[PDB]
Amino acid sequence: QSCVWYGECGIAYGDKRYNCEYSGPPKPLPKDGYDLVQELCPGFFFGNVSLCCDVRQLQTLKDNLQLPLQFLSRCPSCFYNLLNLFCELTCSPRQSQFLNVTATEDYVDPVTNQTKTNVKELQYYVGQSFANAMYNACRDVEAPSSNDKALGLLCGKDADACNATNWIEYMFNKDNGQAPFTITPVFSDFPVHGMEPMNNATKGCDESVDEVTAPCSCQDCSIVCGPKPQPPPPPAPWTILGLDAMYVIMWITYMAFLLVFFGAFFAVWCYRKPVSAAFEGCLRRLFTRWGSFCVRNPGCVIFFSLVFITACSSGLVFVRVTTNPVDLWSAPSSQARLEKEYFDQHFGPFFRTEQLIIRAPLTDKHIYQPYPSGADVPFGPPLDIQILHQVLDLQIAIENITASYDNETVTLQDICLAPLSPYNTNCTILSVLNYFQNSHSVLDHKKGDDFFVYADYHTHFLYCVRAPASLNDTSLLHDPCLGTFGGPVFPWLVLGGYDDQNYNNATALVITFPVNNYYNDTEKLQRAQAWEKEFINFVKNYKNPNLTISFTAERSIEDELNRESDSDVFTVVISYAIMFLYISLALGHVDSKVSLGIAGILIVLSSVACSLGVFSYIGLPLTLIVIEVIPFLVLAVGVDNIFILVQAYQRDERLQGETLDQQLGRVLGEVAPSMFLSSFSETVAFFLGALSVMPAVHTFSLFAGLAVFIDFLLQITCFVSLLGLDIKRQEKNRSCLFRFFKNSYSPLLLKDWMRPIVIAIFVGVLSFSIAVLNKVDIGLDQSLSMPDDSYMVDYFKSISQYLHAGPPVYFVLEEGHDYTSSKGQNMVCGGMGCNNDSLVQQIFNAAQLDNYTRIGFAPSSWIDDYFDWVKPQSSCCRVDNITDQFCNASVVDPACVRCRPLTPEGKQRPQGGDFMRFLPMFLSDNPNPKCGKGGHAAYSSAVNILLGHGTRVGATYFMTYHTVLQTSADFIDALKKARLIASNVTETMGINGSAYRVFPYSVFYVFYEQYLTIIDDTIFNLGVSLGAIFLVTMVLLGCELWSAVIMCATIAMVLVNMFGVMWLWGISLNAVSLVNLVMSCGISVEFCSHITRAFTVSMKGSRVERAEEALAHMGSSVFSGITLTKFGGIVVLAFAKSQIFQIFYFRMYLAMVLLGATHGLIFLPVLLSYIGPSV
Template sequence: FQHYTSADNCRSAFKAPLEPSTALGGFSGNNYSEASAFIITYPVNNVVEKEGNETERAVAWEKAFIDLAKNELLPMAQSQSLTLSFSSESSIEEELKRESTADAITIVISYLVMFAYISLTLGDTPRLSTFYVSSKVLLGLTGVVLVMLSVLGSVGFFSAIGVKSTLIIMEVIPFLVLAVGVDNMCILVHAVKRQPLELPIEGRVSNALVEVGPSITLASLSEVLAFAVGSFIPMPACRVFSMFAALAVLLDFLLQVTAFVALIVFDFLRAEDRRVDCFPCLKISSPNTDSDKGTRVRRPGLLARYMKEVHAPILGIWVVKIVVIAIFAAITVASIALATRVEPGLEQQIVLPRDSYLQGYFKNVSEYLRIGPPLYFVVKNYNYSSESNQTNQLCSISQCDSNSLLNEIARESLRPESSHIAKPAASWLDDFLVWVSPEAFGCCRKFTNATYCPPDDQPPCCSSGSGSCGLGGLCKDCTTILEFWQCFRHADLNNDRPSTMQFKEKLPWFLSALPSADCAKGGHGAYTGSVELQGYENGVIQASSFRTYHTPLNKQRDFVDSLRAAREFSSRVSKSLKMEIFPYSVFYMFFEQYLDIWRTALINLAIAIGAVSLVCFVITWSLWSSGIIMLVLAMIVIDLLGVMAILDIQLNAVSVVNLVMSVGIAVEFCVHITHAFTVSIGDREQRVKEALGTMGASVFSGITLTKLVGVIVLCFSRTEVFVVYYFQMYLALVLLGFLHGLVFLPVVLSIFGPPSRCKLVEKQEDRPSVSLRP
């Protein structure tokens, strides 16, 4: 291991020295003999252009490799008590496709549980004798059908204009729209039930729409606007999800205030005619008649009585008010501090199915690898002409600038904890300048016909089978004639640098020269893809790269920090050298989204909350109410960020979507209570009591519990991403919305609530009535 740079058996297939850390793992320091793992890498050619079938061939090769590794190599390794883990560039994409079906049953069960709860909560208090008439299974089913139609309408519209759907869209949006749609269904049906029974069903539905229609419209438009704001997020997954969700929620709202209202009328007519739910053709006769219908009044439910007679009076106690405000304010302040601990990223292990073969691969990479991904510093438009000083601005050998690119990279590698650069860069330019140097005997030689002559230990100078190496054979002239021993003498070079013509002529020789014991500086293999030769004859190399390695990157934060450090370093060196230099590593394209994800998330959340408040102001025409709603929404989002920090939930495309979505969903917990408060009569305490009595029960049973029963099922998901980003975040959102909507908001309204709109209307109506009297 100490002589790995020269030992023949430690060289790669193209005879170049092999870096031990790229092939061995599990050792400490430079103790390579302690290695407990080894790595094999098969590079597969990829192309930028889509023409031809090169990409398809690479993907087909990877697919065949994975099949071979699963079916043959893995059993072979296990039979020898070895651990084998493997991956290809397309593995994550393929495993995500498999994941799309892994939780299909869980999601369907969640939908069924929500549907069952809808059917129960829409109906009256269950009684065995009347359950088959008073239940609302058919009404709930039609409501679910309307939700599915709205989702299909959204998917169909965007598919028609060429916007492709994603995994999140197909699995999450139906759940989201169902959760939002169920709220409106419950509120509408409960409002109809609160109307006097002496009114015809059409009158009851009309009064119900007058009572809850504005708050439903306000909540739905706020949700649509919150999602529409998300369509401006630069991350494609967030943008596409927000577009689909905004249209789906809008279509669902339009269907609910039209088709579902008509279905409510039909269902109540069915129940009053004592026809069986789901089988309306069957009519049940009853000895009791409805002759006293005009005198009957529907008694409020147990939950409504609790809200009005227990919950509201407790919140009305001044000591309780002070404690509630203090606790919620403290939680918000603590959440602001905790939010700074939320890290950007998305662990691959969370996204993948738990039984994926990549789970073991990522675990072993984190545990055994002692070096990170390759890092390339790409230099554009390098001028190698004699008149330019850019060669000395890049190289790191003698007579190069002290602040050259390669010297700066070497300095950065001395502080790997902040730069995330493991070692100095492998430089084709340094090796080329050494290769053409007169001191490098046996490297740059030529035949008598001025063509390249390889070292004596390589064909055709040396045949590996015959052992005829040395002064004889085809390369005799290169070895014995002084003029051809070397390409240049010191007098031929200018300060040991080749001229423009010499550089242009000898660079292709260098890139095709195989390294060997006689000349280890050959560039073939190590630098074959490092220089773009197209158009280099003009004295400018359009693009070239210098390869180094990142330090081991085990956490998502390491990937993000390494990308940020590489970009900051490139920007600084580019300004210093006045050259265009940028870094590249294979993971940069994916992790680039996390550089500004905090800024993106905060801007979109601020816009969403502001837009929702603007909608509230336009519909209610009350800046007072809009300000209170905006305050509560901001507190819910901040507290949700605090929960993310406690649960170690990272900030990524999925969680940003959830945060933007939380603004729309949190509106449900605030708007209905606030609207009921503004249209009630009396002082603030009385209006809070009335608002909780009328809408509190609907918010709890129709919004909180509906979402809760659907979310709890997701904890049984086979995929960690559903457990973390949908079960945990949705559960936290529902609980925070419930606490803020039914505890904190009533207290705030009882102290700082806006005046009743009924009083304002009465005053406006009284003035003209007085002036019109004769």
């Protein structure tokens, strides 16, 4: 047991001093630094602590060993062997057995003039089984705050760059900048030159050093645990063998139907070898009297109707308009809305992000060749230094932005959230320029010498993409890359277009400007939106032909909605102009009814305005989208009713001396039941479709329903009187379709042989529609709701094409958990001693899957960080001795003592009241260079404490990130699976009830919460609306069940074919497509009703003739009344500007129209001819 030294010598460089050389006998260490020995490696701490050692050597070891402690504190296993190496290497008592000093030089004392000898160089003899057990047991640890390979950092060279021998040589070599003097190691397993290397006991990541420190986790050790689980496969289409298993269930059934159908034509060829009408009669008489009444009292009626219109539409003064998207697309009391309501109250609302996806088209990738050694590393086009300067200039200019509002000048610093303030207040900008801190000088300053550059921006970039949380470059660059705001900048948030682990290959640059969003405050929101407007205008007009910018803003969507919503104003006006043109010329043929067409158009707009005004009075706000889609619908229905009545009158011949009233009463009594049926069926259809939970469709449905009902009523009354006035007029000088239907079409269509083919064809199309039913999309694209000429479309394309990370997730653990106990922490903390099914571990596994579960990254929990901070080893914590105030980590150390005693007892987790005593100081910790990251910048928001009564903890969250989400399927999949993870954790916590529960909050959950129940919502809505139609028909048409059931079956056929057309044109099944289907099922009656009544009330002999008589009579008015009108309406809307209209309203209505026309005018005729109700 000989010495190699005692004492230390003068300064070598920086603060580094070469130890003084002295190989004599040992010396018990002074009672002064008991504290280091215990702490460094107590394996030396017994009795007489005789050691060739000095307390200033212990404290310079302890002091120099800070980073390795930072990257390896997680496994005491590897940390403790590395420590066992330095302490023994430094002042073990048998230093001469395994050490050989080779170089040494004289030292001068400025105190006594005595020349000593510094140890410049020496050879270190290290056992092989020690380096093997150390590197192999800690070698799998990745570095924290990154997916690196913590050895990738503490080795100076990448995972594949160093082995176990080279890494130790590099660590001991001062050529790196850490070793104060170089130690030359020598591989040895057997004693050579009498210099026996070191081979003390070694411990792996699978074993704990002491009975109170749990072993390291299998995240950081590969023998304890493994990738054991794997998602299952999605086997569907169901029963593939078959070709969809629905292509077959339908095709096979159809073949059976075709055989059972043509086999009765075949067997026929072979054989060749006071309630019944009590309610339908009182209506006729009443309408007969009331039409007469309104015709002989025109003045009173029309005047009262105008007074009513005005009295009802003056309530339009209280009209309020909603433009805020949350209110539009989210139910006020949906589960996701309540979750969001809880999150905004305790943690403040999620902030607003202004992205910027920069791209350099005019540049090519260039190559980086490392000077010392290394394979070439190509950098994408956007990572050029010149392009980086131009983008930095753009960013610094975006920071200028002022745009004073309401006699007040606000700035980005003023609104941008600064996490750790007011200490550092610059603010959060998440751009790749933060690695250089937005400094042209920092970006260009180089650390090399002529003929080669040692370090370069790539050198810094490469280092900090590997470790964005370093406080120094540590590759001799000596430049910190934490960011001006203080806090890491994760490379996946500031880049896009790279390849899975090669930020070198980045093709795009992401630049975020997070801005604080405020809860119950309007001046701040006004100021922020006013700032965002100027930001948008600037970015839109910026001229840098070298760059292609795609931008957005939190307020961009709402603004876009109001800009696309006002550009169709011309469209609704033109639609009515063309409708009036058609009505004016077709309504009968100075045999012109222009006056009546104008009267009808004004009555329709009056009905629209009256609905809007009444509901504004009630307090329902306008969506301005409705104000554009509602007029069309109401116009269609109102014009149809007007034509029915006027034409039945025109074709009615006047009896004997009848003046005017008798004729009008007769016409109204025979035509009103049918028009009344259509109008009432539609009103009920609309109102009933107004029961879905979505405020936009709910309010729209109400508005449209009321407008149809009031328009029908007002029409029948004011318009029959005005018809009387115009009929009296023209009686003082002041058909070709019907001919066709009766002469050549009704007979043709009803031939014996054409009828079976037609029925076969329609049932075949119905089978197809039913077959392709389940293959309809779910959800709305989110990029099609914007006009085509909008920059948000380009931004969405750019996202889908470049971005690699998604929306952040917060797993909010509601208020009520304990947190001050070992088990209470095990249910949560993803750590050493905490459970294996803990919240953090479950979120970690989810992030490990990443395709099944879309949660992409690790939890970034706050409690793990808090414990890491409070550990006595770290020494970050330090309280004042007399004041009990937090002594910063950079302090003169006058009298500050460690918070937790550095003992075996102190080593445990702080479970008791110390927990809550020190938690606030941690949350108050700043990013100290000695200590580390500190928490203030990351967890102050995430942890809530209620003052008083023991300061019990509030709701906390563990925020992670989603995977890049590009379509509705992707969003719905993410919501579902986040809810599932939460469900698992809630189960595992085992609450004695539901006092509290985990739930995830992300920004899009409220908009996508409807697609978790849209299928049962659709089923219920369609079924209920159709049952209402059924009942209304079977009641109003008398009580005949056969006609009612036939009509209901035909409209159901119409809906199924509607679903087929949906699938075929790529329309999606969101709450708008669903409202339109429930509406179409109500608009179909206008076709299906006339024919069936003309057939039912008929007294010919046989079924065929009844059908042909009904066809002629009523279908002459039905083809001219409904089809052409609705066609004029839809063709003007076919040129939309919001995409949402042009896709859903236009396609759904065109489909409905042509489908209803064919069905009514062809398939109803034929089906009744075959199986129609006799009489």
